[PDB]
Design a protein around this ligand. Structure first.
Ligand code: FES
Ligand code: FES
Ligand code: FES
Ligand SMILES: [Fe+2]
Ligand SMILES: [Fe+2]
Ligand SMILES: [Fe+2]
Lengths: 182, 436, 436, 182, 436, 182
């Protein structure tokens, strides 16, 4: 239920775990901001479901109708290979919308971790503000929350994103486009 | 301000010359709202958006917000989403099912037909009657459909929808009339904003295969091809045609026979369903009566002024105007109702991946329009005509096998028709001449 | 552009019809600045804002920034906050006490009366005199007050403030003349921006109790009621009247006798002070001479064009225009000077809670105006008149007990007067006819 | 003195305390962003003074005049019961300005903690960026700092807000309105 | 709209009166693009920006984006950065070296001279020829230089650059012709946006030393002085003059002899290089032939309409118009080519510190323009003329030692000339009268 | 190479170090937001190189041309004394552009620390969003990344900024001006 927060514990997880997750996210952000898309892609599991649902306007009583359900149209509904394919286009030197490339900044905060019943598997909530500046004066701000299922691993950056659901705080997309990953 | 003669001169249909100002002039935009948007048949959505009685959708007709709602008798009514008391928005939700509509400013209530049925303190404040609720319901629009698509027009003097569509329906049928079961619309409409004039978008979907056949989507093709295949392994077919509606400015283009091109975009699963098997055969049976639809690849089409879609890819959208320098793109996906569920799912995913805002094709489309609009701030940039003469007066490019006026797939004949009809609606006050 | 005849036709005072364009047309807005704002008496604040000599406040008159400053002789001067040299803002602070004003662009200095008293290098650069500092001080505005409220008008041909107020002063007195001690203003002016036309706001406070009596504030009432009380326990009184100024477009409405309604908003502490005890009795003594002020509940009022306040609740504000699609709301709170300190505190808190931006009432007020303004982008939305005929020509709604032209509490007679006077200022070039 | 920062220590508080406070704030933010106003109200003490003063423009020398003093008009000057009353209206289904509800994101950062002389009582500074998107395309950004007095408790989320003073970085409110709590 | 007579009346060159509307009127702005920017010689950059063949820079001429590129024959070509097909931007990079330019919308390719050399599918789509690539290259602009600075003008009927510069070149030489080695431009152009009319900026650099001599830069001087020195230790020289071009609206001012003032800004290292030693002596030899350049301190200058620079400080910039309420400042730094590397470095750092956006001087400059622009929203603020009579008709202020019409350093004679020429370009349709 | 991220370790630094650096930055931000410029200046080493390069637009292949190199023109290229001089002007009461002073908020996040070969010397990456509101309704947002070389000390706030390179995410400056330090 995307209309309710993840079931985070009242008592927060350990300092060590909290820091590892935040540090992982800050590094992920750096990969996007410096256009190292391949290294970024490597942080996703083969089973990744990268989804950013369409959000609609209704009265609070009808809030159950806010999110276009799974299986419906969406802004993003990707798999590891579809993301790989998008990346192929992005670094081809022929993706005019992102070449010249945008100047982005992926700010991450409000990291809340929930330990699931499966050891090493976490469900994480985090707020994001992705700033994007391009061409001469084009500027956009993308704000929302990311709900991830992270797998703690012993190599790489210590984690892998097994699932990401992006709650973009917009109904109609006000930005010029959605060329940035969140 | 602008005389009809000056307006008509903005477009040279014969030589193929466009005055850049038609895309930037604010005064001309105001005229468009009056002479184009207020009297054209505009796409509001699909019947599947409001299947049950009471079901409604809030959308636009130009910049006028409207409510689209299914009546108990199965008919569809469309009226201005504005309360005549002080102008408040009547329904602020995106869609749903209602038994009534209420303006929260002063409580004026309406039925699902748009009739003002309740005015708080009516007898105490409006009478002692000279006030009749029957005279104050929001403006109603004429409503009609064409094989699933819902259209509306405010002008009671305008020609009916079918007549308006001229000889363009056979081409629309390629996407909308493949089965007796009709089409369904995938749940979820995507709405996005783009800082460009609506004409650039509508024109492109009406006559511009050229951008796709050249540089615009080289990255898009790379994204949709299998990892082991690259651009050198894709032959862009030399053979395709374009249709220009006899009347109305509608247009559509396509490549002939080489479905490998459509497969490079939608994948083999979609292409096989579209070209082989019972479904494909059933479609040929229906469509072949009017045109060789079975050879049409990567078709693009626009129903003047702002209804665009891509038969085969199946993305459909309305370009809502927002002044001369901006538009909103409201898109959705249609699929054959009796198509296999896995085929419907494939269409959903491929569409999100390609022609959705954020897709590997759509983003590069807006990129050009946006840059073009920015440049129009310049005085010299607006002082000379844009070149729309491609194929103008050039013989031996038509293909009689297809109905109506046709030309090469890379052509601006349809575009010429698009802008010509635009110039006519803009310069002709009465339908007495316009319907001709 | 617009002829006086066309302008006058935008409002049908008799049938009660408003052309939507008056709220959106940019050209008409420019005319408003000239024919309405540049020659009307505008609210600048309260005398308590600048009590001592040298005390000043920076505010607006339409879109012209002005400095309001107390003189040594106790008079008040108001002049354009613009240096005549190159147009720089003279005073950039919000308020304070000054001995002089200096333009930091080139150092031109002014005294507290707005006289240019120092020009750097005057003798070296302006002379060898043909330059006189006496001719270059910023434009001065006429200034007057009405029981605490400060008003200003640029037009020397306009009628004085009192005359301008027509027969509306007794109604203003309900809030401003309750004691011989006068009123004080609570420290702190709230400034906020709202994307809507100023007329919607001013009109509402002038004639629209109807929105409050219906749906607009159901949540506001719930917020101000005691937790154990709900809406079913609040009877909205059937009895109230509305006043339309004989001249000027001013207006005010109120409910009669049932103070439980005002208590539902301001609480028992405020209501008891307003209706029982020495203060209340003292007020009846003064006000009763002109009208039965002691029965007026939840009164709302507007002094044309943009001075609005709610006697009893005591919020006061000026609606500053910012083009046809935006305004700024500059509000403050007034209290009786000799009122008990705990009463002043109660008024402060209740006001912040209800009619301050962020309050449980005010936010729902702007909600309607904002939505209305958005809709006016539509062509059809601006093509038909808004319905302002409520109670038009309907007899037996007046109450002779109150002075002037009156009607039912739910009525648009005052609104009709508001827009009618607007149409007059907009279409009548000279005060020769306008003052009549 | 709101024109000077709280007296934070040069040496920061313990890791454990720093994390508990941040995690508390992130959870508070989640309650606001998912409209669970009652659970949010429960984080305030009965003695809470929720205040957001009006800020004015003056020369640096006259900076002492920037803030409208206590006892003056303000954007917010609330008590536990006034907040409760505002909440009652918010979830009534009749508060048109927030129904349909806004899509908000309460980003919190720069958390600086000061331990007072009273054990369990802390004074905290934190920067906030509250993003709000509503209707079709309405978007607003509220940025400022919150100065709180927090009481560490053994139940709930571990803390209770005994006092909050919001320094909104604006003089004139540029946003469409102030329907969001900070 | 506006008649030539009404336009000419906006400026009173004799009494020195400016109608505020020239800075805010949108219609007048559109006219400026046509009668001012589209036919003036505009600064595009410095030759050092494009030293090698194929080197290019993308900049503006009014609001028209243009490409500036070095040809193989060493000449410079400037053409509209807009593809004539549908208006797409041809080159989206800021600068670089190219062998060709390609429009990514439909692939139209161009050579470094701006010739359309390749149109995809030309023979298949445009022929069966009636289409000639030779007729569709982007508009070319006339290009010329003046000792390092690159200028462009679209009007073939306008006077050549040198003629256009009138008798102002000797003053330009103070910065540009100090050595036979020419000047170099430091790598890196700073681009910033400022919400004000371009005229305020250009005028200030043309005739306003007054703001610097009074209050505008008291903080800037404090920042550039040594820590042990304060304002009381800086005597602002009483002696300086100002030049008004015989034709064209160009202007420049400066203080005489007291270089301590320039040292207070640029430091002793820069000042000594400028006043003592072989370099200084070499400069006197060249410049002294036309004017006593060796006594000019803190010189400011504007070449109508938007070319401004400060000889000695060496910041150069173009003010690009962006409507009546906004501009972009594109600045760069020039240094003598044969100057010691440590001198070039000192100029770089001092410039970043002072006249770069973010600098201790430049920021206070925009502060005034911004506030002035905001105030012009007011009706009364635009109803009375701004005072530009400083020194008007005042005798004994000129200094015959300098060539042309001169006056005191604190004077608005140059400004009067600036606005007068503006009024002429705006009201005179043909160069037949304008060149006189 | 500003077109590539600093070489942060895959495994993040200790909790203690991470917290000290963040807490230092939050305090630095407070000094700027409350206009205590002298105390701020005291956080910079005498050898500080405060630089904010001009950024330009090019195709991804030509990305090596994005940044105007050192020795070229720039938005900021300061030394300890030039910063001191700017500060002198700022607090003089005569710097009209910042008097009346702006209302700012220096939000800091995404703090990633790298330990260099020199003990006590760190290279740090952090994202920033500097909000600025001034006069009546002027509002600007400055977003970017700061790359610092910090020296850990035993006094003051525990660190000193020996070098700061600001990557402002803009080509043309869209803000009204650059009166704020980052
Ligand atoms: S505007 Fe709808 S009832 Fe008043
Ligand atoms: S604008 Fe005020 S002294 Fe020049
Ligand atoms: S717009 Fe350049 S090739 Fe079409
Ligand atoms: Fe395309
Ligand atoms: Fe109300
Ligand atoms: Fe200056």
């Amino acid at each position: 239920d995307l209309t309710k927060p993840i079931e985070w514990p009242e008592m927060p997880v350990s300092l060590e775990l909290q820091n590892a997750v935040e540090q992982f996210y800050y590094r992920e952000a750096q990969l996007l901001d410096y256009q190292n898309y391949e290294a970024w892609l490597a942080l996703l599991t083969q089973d990744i479901q990268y989804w950013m649902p369409i959000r609609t306007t209704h009265t609070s009583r009808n809030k159950a109708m806010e999110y276009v359900p799974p299986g419906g149209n969406a802004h993003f509904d990707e798999t590891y290979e579809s993301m790989r394919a998008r990346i192929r286009a992005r670094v081809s030197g022929l993706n005019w919308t992102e070449d010249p490339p945008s100047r982005s900044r992926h700010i991450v905060s409000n990291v809340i971790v929930r330990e699931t019943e499966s050891a090493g598997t976490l469900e994480v909530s985090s707020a994001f503000l992705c700033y994007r500046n391009r061409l001469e004066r084009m500027t956009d701000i993308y704000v929302g929350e990311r709900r991830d299922i992270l797998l703690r691993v012993s190599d790489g950056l210590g984690f892998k994103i097994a699932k990401r659901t992006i709650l973009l705080d917009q109904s109609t997309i006000t930005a010029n486009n959605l060329s940035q990953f969140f | 301000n602008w005389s009809d003669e000056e307006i008509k001169a903005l477009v040279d249909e014969e030589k193929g010359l466009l005055d850049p100002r038609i895309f930037s002039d604010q005064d001309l935009y105001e005229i468009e709202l009056e002479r184009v948007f207020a009297r054209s048949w505009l796409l509001l959505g699909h019947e599947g958006h409001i299947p049950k009685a009471g079901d409604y959708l809030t959308t636009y007709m130009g910049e006028d917000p409207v409510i689209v709602v299914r009546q108990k008798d199965r008919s569809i009514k469309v009226f201005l989403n504005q309360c005549r008391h002080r102008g408040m928005r009547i329904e602020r939700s995106d869609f749903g099912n209602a038994k009534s509509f209420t303006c929260t400013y002063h409580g004026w209530a309406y039925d699902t037909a748009g009739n003002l049925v309740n005015v708080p303190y009516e007898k105490e404040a409006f009478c002692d009657c000279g006030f009749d609720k029957a005279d104050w319901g929001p403006l109603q629009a004429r409503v009609d459909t064409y094989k699933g698509l819902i259209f509306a027009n405010w002008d009671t003097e305008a020609p009916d929808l079918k007549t308006y569509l001229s000889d363009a329906t056979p081409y629309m049928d390629v996407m909308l009339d493949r089965t007796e079961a009709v089409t369904q619309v995938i749940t979820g409409m995507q709405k996005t904003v783009i800082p460009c004039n609506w004409k650039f978008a509508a024109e492109q979907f009406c006559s511009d295969m050229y951008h796709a056949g050249t540089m615009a989507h080289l990255s898009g093709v790379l994204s949709s091809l299998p990892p082991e295949m690259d651009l050198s392994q894709v032959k862009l077919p030399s053979s395709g045609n374009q249709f220009r509606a006899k009347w109305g400015g509608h247009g559509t283009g396509w490549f002939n026979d080489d479905f490998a091109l459509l497969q490079a975009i939608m994948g083999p699963k979609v292409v096989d369903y579209w070209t082989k098997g019972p479904a494909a055969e059933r479609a040929k049976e229906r469509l072949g009566k009017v045109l060789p639809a079975d050879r049409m690849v990567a078709q693009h089409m626009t129903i003047f002024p702002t209804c665009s879609f891509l038969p085969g890819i199946n993305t459909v959208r309305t370009w809502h105007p927002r002044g001369p320098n901006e538009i909103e793109v409201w898109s959705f996906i249609v699929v054959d109702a009796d198509a296999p569920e896995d085929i419907k799912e494939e269409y959903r995913r491929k569409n999100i991946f390609t022609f959705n805002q954020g897709g590997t094709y759509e983003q590069d489309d807006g990129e050009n329009w946006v840059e073009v609009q920015r440049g129009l701030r310049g005085y010299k940039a607006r002082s000379r005509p844009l070149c729309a003469q491609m194929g103008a007066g050039v013989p031996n490019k038509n293909n009689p096998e297809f109905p109506g006026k046709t030309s090469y797939v890379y052509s601006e004949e349809a575009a010429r028709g698009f802008y010509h009809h635009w110039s006519r609606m803009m310069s002709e006050p009465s339908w007495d001449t316009l319907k001709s």
